[PDB]
Design a protein around this motif. Structure first.
Motif, PDB file in Angstrom:
ATOM      1  N   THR A 152       0.875  -1.114  -0.037  1.00 47.83           N
ATOM      2  CA  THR A 152       0.010  -0.102   0.039  1.00 47.83           C
ATOM      3  C   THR A 152       1.128   1.326  -0.072  1.00 47.83           C
ATOM      4  O   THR A 152       1.970   1.180   0.181  1.00 47.83           O
ATOM      5  CB  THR A 152      -0.878  -0.042   1.277  1.00 47.83           C
ATOM      6  OG1 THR A 152       0.007  -0.032   2.392  1.00 47.83           O
ATOM      7  CG2 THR A 152      -1.817  -1.046   1.461  1.00 47.83           C
ATOM      8  N   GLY A 153       0.378   2.519  -0.446  1.00 46.14           N
ATOM      9  CA  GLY A 153       1.025   3.571  -0.266  1.00 46.14           C
ATOM     10  C   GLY A 153       1.837   4.111  -1.301  1.00 46.14           C
ATOM     11  O   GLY A 153       2.753   5.166  -1.249  1.00 46.14           O
ATOM     12  N   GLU A 156       2.609   6.328  -4.639  1.00 42.80           N
ATOM     13  CA  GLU A 156       2.439   7.628  -5.006  1.00 42.80           C
ATOM     14  C   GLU A 156       2.548   7.869  -6.477  1.00 42.80           C
ATOM     15  O   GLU A 156       2.017   8.961  -6.894  1.00 42.80           O
ATOM     16  CB  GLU A 156       3.421   8.758  -4.186  1.00 42.80           C
ATOM     17  CG  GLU A 156       2.820   8.596  -2.666  1.00 42.80           C
ATOM     18  CD  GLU A 156       3.981   9.490  -1.901  1.00 42.80           C
ATOM     19  OE1 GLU A 156       4.379  10.577  -2.445  1.00 42.80           O
ATOM     20  OE2 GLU A 156       4.722   9.015  -0.905  1.00 42.80           O
ATOM     21  N   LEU A 157       3.346   7.279  -7.216  1.00 37.09           N
ATOM     22  CA  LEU A 157       3.622   7.515  -8.492  1.00 37.09           C
ATOM     23  C   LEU A 157       2.644   6.558  -9.386  1.00 37.09           C
ATOM     24  O   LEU A 157       2.861   5.493  -9.530  1.00 37.09           O
ATOM     25  CB  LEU A 157       4.939   7.125  -8.870  1.00 37.09           C
ATOM     26  CG  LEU A 157       5.788   8.020  -9.541  1.00 37.09           C
ATOM     27  CD1 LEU A 157       7.248   7.739 -10.170  1.00 37.09           C
ATOM     28  CD2 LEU A 157       5.196   8.600 -10.731  1.00 37.09           C
ATOM     29  N   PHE A 158       1.816   7.460  -9.992  1.00 38.09           N
ATOM     30  CA  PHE A 158       0.853   6.858 -10.728  1.00 38.09           C
ATOM     31  C   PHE A 158       0.504   8.082 -11.921  1.00 38.09           C
ATOM     32  O   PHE A 158       0.652   9.063 -11.740  1.00 38.09           O
ATOM     33  CB  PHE A 158      -0.443   6.485 -10.318  1.00 38.09           C
ATOM     34  CG  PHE A 158      -1.015   7.520  -9.142  1.00 38.09           C
ATOM     35  CD1 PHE A 158      -1.809   8.325  -9.858  1.00 38.09           C
ATOM     36  CD2 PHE A 158      -0.698   7.678  -7.954  1.00 38.09           C
ATOM     37  CE1 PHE A 158      -2.558   9.453  -9.049  1.00 38.09           C
ATOM     38  CE2 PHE A 158      -1.164   8.646  -7.232  1.00 38.09           C
ATOM     39  CZ  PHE A 158      -1.987   9.543  -7.664  1.00 38.09           C
ATOM     40  N   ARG A 171      -3.879  15.593  -9.099  1.00 38.70           N
ATOM     41  CA  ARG A 171      -3.302  13.981  -8.602  1.00 38.70           C
ATOM     42  C   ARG A 171      -4.811  13.385  -8.170  1.00 38.70           C
ATOM     43  O   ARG A 171      -5.028  12.116  -8.498  1.00 38.70           O
ATOM     44  CB  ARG A 171      -2.244  14.129  -7.693  1.00 38.70           C
ATOM     45  CG  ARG A 171      -1.035  14.167  -8.231  1.00 38.70           C
ATOM     46  CD  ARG A 171       0.223  14.510  -7.375  1.00 38.70           C
ATOM     47  NE  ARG A 171       0.236  13.423  -6.623  1.00 38.70           N
ATOM     48  CZ  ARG A 171       0.496  12.342  -6.722  1.00 38.70           C
ATOM     49  NH1 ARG A 171       1.046  11.843  -7.971  1.00 38.70           N
ATOM     50  NH2 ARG A 171       0.895  11.237  -5.710  1.00 38.70           N
ATOM     51  N   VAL A 204      -2.605  10.144  -3.000  1.00 34.34           N
ATOM     52  CA  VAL A 204      -2.436  11.484  -3.592  1.00 34.34           C
ATOM     53  C   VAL A 204      -1.298  12.677  -2.983  1.00 34.34           C
ATOM     54  O   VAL A 204      -0.550  12.897  -3.704  1.00 34.34           O
ATOM     55  CB  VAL A 204      -3.621  12.218  -3.602  1.00 34.34           C
ATOM     56  CG1 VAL A 204      -3.897  13.567  -4.281  1.00 34.34           C
ATOM     57  CG2 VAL A 204      -4.888  11.101  -4.280  1.00 34.34           C
TER      58      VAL A 204
END
Ligand SMILES: NC(=O)c1ccc[n+]([C@@H]2O[C@H](COP(=O)([O-])OP(=O)(O)OC[C@H]3O[C@@H](n4cnc5c(N)ncnc54)[C@H](OP(=O)(O)O)[C@@H]3O)[C@@H](O)[C@H]2O)c1
Ligand SMILES: NC(=O)c1ccc[n+]([C@@H]2O[C@H](COP(=O)([O-])OP(=O)(O)OC[C@H]3O[C@@H](n4cnc5c(N)ncnc54)[C@H](OP(=O)(O)O)[C@@H]3O)[C@@H](O)[C@H]2O)c1
Lengths: 658, 658
Positions: free
Chosen positions: A398-399, A401-403, A626, A658
């Protein structure tokens, strides 16, 4: 064997919930042998009296005197009851004075059903007994610990409660998994507040050997009973999935589709040229995978499975007479053969034993011993200790942030879509999402489901243009989100994409009190229950209803943390984020393994520290963009060809920050 | 205090590396007091003799007899030397017979420099001493453990080695962090192979109180010495970043830009209307943030900082005479005032003490005690125990799989770009990447840097069209990747995006041998070193060179696992993925905190289990498309306006799984 234990906790006072049997009984026993005075709490007096007698006898055997003063019991103590917890603390302080060690061990298995078969009150009960109870006892005992300058809170979680940065899916146990993850999350977020005087940690054992008729289920005692339930559940899941799929692309009503099942004849359904492909293909599988000696190979279902299926359909807003199955032909026993049940039972057992690198399960004694040695460590807080481990099992990190945005192919699937947005506090987020789906991605309509009239009016004014044009409809749900969703289904149609944000913001009260204070303003036991209701149960109720209602996708959104949020808000937000990850991962896998199309994922508006948050209007606009990208990435449906086994597992049970 | 310890490990034989002092000395002491016979290994004989004498005296005091037979020493044992490790095992088996407990404690602080100032041989040395040594001793001792039916391997890692699913950035300590993460990863991946006879775990303490002149640096002993080095390093970083930035958008050569620094006058640089903005703005900051009594406020640098800067520039392929700084005016002492050094020293100390929830650091004794109790637990393997913890520190979650393409704004930044692709084994991946950048995103050219002529020819044939058109150039690097990059810079220009894949595939040898076997075919100590060279050092060498050479972006790609990969390949792949995450996270933060533009991230072609892998040609095409999307997401440069503090931290130090 007790030479290294005697003296280790001399002078300490320990309270052990669930201390009449199982791991808790062994922890109480070994702490007493270690020299601690112990209060054992549980419901049944007889079992408490037996355990007390056994420990008192062992204490006398090793040389303790006045053993009646070293082991007390608190019967009638159901940890799900706040009143009983208050009485437990009064009784314990009266007997021993300040508690040094709070062992939050008591844990119930819970509902043991998939979310879509899980009663909302059953979920609440599990949270009260396994999680809220832990906060309640800490809230009552931590003040005295801080005053004396020392204390220890140990929450007995499970390997299936996940770990820092990784959720562990526990299908058919979402309530339990969430409770276990919350116990660990509480230790992780409260450590900074309770230090330096108080240590708070969790233990997360894997499966433990114990009484086959008891336990939290990591070790299934009755593999055969577990096997039969799996087979009955599998029949329900296969029938339900085929009916939902068929209704999505057939002109027949669900009522008309269920009529095809009433002859209760597998071969007749398979051979019916007018039956939907999904149902004919299912019938073929029942024949192919079935045992000819089992009635389940020739009959579609029985009264029990039929009732549970009807409940699923009614709970999803499908219209069917309550007596639709009243004349269902009753299949002759056996519905499932001893051979089928025995083979599944071996699968369940080999599945559990095969997780073990050491090829042996620890005993309750072994786990208690490692735990009692661990309690001597004064340099650990916010940690999760694994007294037993070495497990091959699936984790969902989980966790991330890069998307970026989803593919144009997924985005095209939003055109003409019916979108449901749920929230109240995050007005800007809801406005931007509504406009994105309507103005950029061609959704036909957005149903804005809020909590109050004030919220409805706020959104109607923010989206006045779309309201006037008939593209934004508003519904006021109050504490009846399921009924509000039913209103949306009947008047506006079933949902494709759904975004679920919390109605309420996080509270700003203190999480710990000053040493020489009464802690009157500190987060209350009731306020902690309310936090779980608004920030966990809210999402569970929506996920359960949307899945039963054949929603295409569902984004669970956690509370928002900003560079302005209080330190306490950051703590509560991170508690929710970690705990909800357990729910998202579990329901994602349940859905995938049961052939449900719904894509369920989590979008986190919470971050670990304020330094990571936007500090200026440019960074804020980057953050809100984001947020929209994250929601689109998890809600744009998969073109059905792309929902491969490979891609399907990727797009379910995940969380992004985000 | 030793009542609970005496007898706990009676009959056991333990080998403790680094057992003359620090945590290892205390572990050796307490295991001996617990009843184990111990071999203490280290380099200095005198310190080993002192420690042996102290333990033997304490053993006699508690009642042990023949204490000379319970504590042996192995001086001259540098764990970085394979020969010395072999001799250590011969000596230990001669003295005590089969080893029950291997305590891989020895650890060196390492180079203690940023990657761009880190000698490649220094990195290799750290890996040999802290990580490869752990495998070597396991390879020699595990055979005897399996034969006797029992064993324990404990690797002494660090909190800064990360945890499952989370990397922890350790700026200025990449070599150390990677070594620590590898120690944990070894336990995590080898547990299934070494079970059921052998347990393998790691301990990961946080900062521990100890000798100020010793230790691995989690606790800085000499805060003031640490402070001055931080200030000298900060001057180097600020000057280097401004020079690199200026050279990117100025017509002047780096030689001409460095000439502006030769008067060594801050005010003159600030007031020079023809000086690049980056250098004038830096000069202003030196004056604003400086101490007027420090020469660093009026002078740009000194001979030491100048030499280290020149090395950075030369190592990045910048052309400058070696004597360029020979006539640099020497600033008068003090360059940094005692006041500046003392303030930074307080910052370093408060930074470390402020991480502690319990506001106290554990002692080596406390950590050893918790560790010796932990070793009694027979139900844990593949786990990382935190004997000390409760730390506020940054983590970078790893393992995210849900992502999409970057923004068209980032993608537009690829047009006219010079791309470097590095690899050999992953021919299909390299072909698809080259064509994506050239055919879809308008890159001007791709430099394909391979290991061998056979690799070069394979790629030239796969990309024949682009080769004939002058858009695909091939370079053969062999074991000289830095020189190959220098060839690329001189002939084709500095790189924008860079993708670094491993030249070699993973080996297919066994990781453990049969109980009654000699293990002759099992992964050798040399083969494990080779794995680290090809799968870790390869990426480090490229990251160091590309960062020094002003590359825009860098994707570190881990080895590929398929549904056909061997179980051993899955283990080695996951070992590399976890260990490299420590490197990626650390260098990402170093780069961000030092004003370097380079975006460094990791793309994982490795997965935890075969069930997650593509099973058919459709799923395979989905996977290869995700690979290209992942690389594009981390390599498309940020339009410079978008590189906010907020977005910059998001786009550095991250890892995604295809
Ligand atoms: N069993 C495992 O394999 C396993 C693995 C990981 C984690 N855990 C965790 O370990 C803890 C103990 O599990 P266990 O297997 O020992 O359970 P168990 O065998 O069911 O423990 C029973 C004990 O809990 C008491 N108890 C049950 N329901 C209670 C309630 N509502 N209020 C108060 N006391 C209650 C029982 O007495 P009464 O029935 O009279 O109340 C008895 O003292 C739980 O938190 C569990 O999640 C267990
Ligand atoms: N210190 C901390 O705060 C901390 C925190 C987390 C983890 N750790 C881990 O704990 C372990 C021990 O750390 P420490 O602080 O105790 O270190 P330390 O104080 O430097 O330990 C020194 C011991 O290691 C030996 N040693 C040093 N270099 C050696 C080499 N190349 N080969 C063999 N022996 C060598 C020393 O003897 P010789 O010099 O004579 O060889 C002595 O016996 C390491 O793995 C470290 O990473 C430490």
């Amino acid at each position: 064997w007790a030479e290294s234990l005697i003296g280790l906790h001399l002078g300490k006072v320990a309270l052990i919930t669930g201390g009449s049997a199982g791991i808790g009984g062994q922890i109480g026993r070994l702490l007493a042998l270690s020299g601690a005075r112990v209060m054992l709490a549980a419901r049944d007096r007889h079992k408490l009296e037996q355990m007390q007698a056994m420990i008192q006898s062992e204490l006398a055997e090793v040389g303790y005197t006045d053993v009646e003063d070293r082991v007390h019991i608190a019967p009638g103590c159901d940890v799900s009851s706040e009143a009983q917890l208050a009485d437990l603390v009064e009784r314990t302080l009266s007997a021993f004075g300040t508690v040094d060690y709070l062992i939050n061990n008591a844990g119930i298995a819970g509902v043991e059903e998939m979310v879509i078969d899980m009663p909302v009150e059953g979920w609440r009960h599990t949270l009260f007994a396994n999680l809220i109870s832990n906060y309640s006892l800490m809230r009552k005992l931590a003040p005295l610990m801080k005053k004396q300058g020392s204390g220890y809170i140990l929450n007995v979680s499970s390997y299936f409660g996940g770990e820092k940065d990784a959720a562990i899916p526990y299908p058919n146990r979402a309530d339990y998994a969430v409770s276990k993850a919350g116990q660990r999350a509480m230790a992780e977020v409260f450590a900074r507040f309770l230090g330096p005087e108080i240590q708070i940690n969790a233990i997360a054992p894997g499966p433990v050997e114990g009484d086959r008729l008891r336990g939290t289920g990591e070790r299934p005692g009755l593999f055969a009973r577990r096997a039969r339930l799996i087979l009955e559940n599998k029949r329900l899941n296969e029938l339900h999935a085929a009916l939902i799929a068929a209704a999505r692309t057939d002109e027949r009503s669900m009522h008309e589709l269920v009529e095809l099942l009433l002859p209760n004849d597998v071969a007749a359904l398979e051979q019916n040229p007018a039956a939907p492909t999904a149902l004919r293909e299912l019938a073929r599988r029942f024949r192919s995978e079935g045992d000819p000696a089992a009635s389940s190979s020739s009959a579609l279902l029985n009264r029990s499975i039929a009732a549970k299926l009807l409940a699923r359909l009614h709970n999803g807003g499908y219209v069917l007479p309550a007596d639709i199955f009243a004349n269902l032909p009753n299949p002759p026993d056996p519905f499932f053969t001893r051979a089928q049940i025995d083979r599944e039972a071996r699968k369940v057992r080999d599945g559990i034993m095969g997780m073990l690198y050491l090829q042996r399960m620890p005993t309750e004694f072994d786990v208690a011993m490692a735990t009692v040695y661990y309690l001597a460590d004064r340099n650990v807080s916010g940690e999760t200790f694994h007294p037993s481990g070495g497990l091959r099992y699936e984790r969902t990190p989980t966790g991330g942030e890069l998307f970026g945005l989803p593919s144009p192919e997924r985005l095209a699937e939003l055109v003409g879509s019916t979108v449901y947005l749920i929230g109240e506090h995050l007005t800007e987020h809801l406005n931007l999402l509504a406009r994105a789906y309507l103005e950029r991605y061609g959704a036909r309509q957005v149903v804005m489901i809020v909590e109050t009239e004030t919220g409805a009016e706020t959104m109607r004014r923010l989206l006045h243009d779309h309201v006037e044009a008939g593209r934004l409809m508003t519904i006021v749900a109050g504490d009846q989100i399921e009924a509000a969703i039913d209103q949306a289904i009947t008047r506006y149609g079933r949902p494709g994409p759904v975004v679920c944000t919390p109605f309420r913001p996080l509270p700003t009260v203190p999480l710990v009190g000053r040493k020489d204070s009464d802690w009157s303003t500190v987060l209350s036991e009731a306020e902690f229950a309310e936090l779980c209701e608004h920030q966990l149960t809210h999402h569970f109720r929506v996920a359960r209803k949307i899945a039963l209602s054949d929603g295409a996708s569902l984004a669970l959104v956690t509370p928002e943390t900003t560079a302005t949020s209080t330190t306490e808000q950051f703590a509560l937000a991170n508690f929710i984020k970690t705990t909800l990850h357990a729910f998202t991962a579990t329901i994602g896998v349940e859905s995938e393994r049961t052939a449900q199309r719904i894509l369920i994922n989590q979008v986190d508006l919470t971050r670990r520290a304020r330094a990571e948050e936007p500090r200026d209007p440019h960074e804020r606009q980057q953050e809100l963009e984001r947020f929209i990208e994250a929601v689109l990435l998890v809600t744009a449906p998969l073109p059905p060809e792309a929902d491969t086994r490979y891609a399907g597992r990727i797009h379910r049970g995940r969380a992004i920050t985000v």
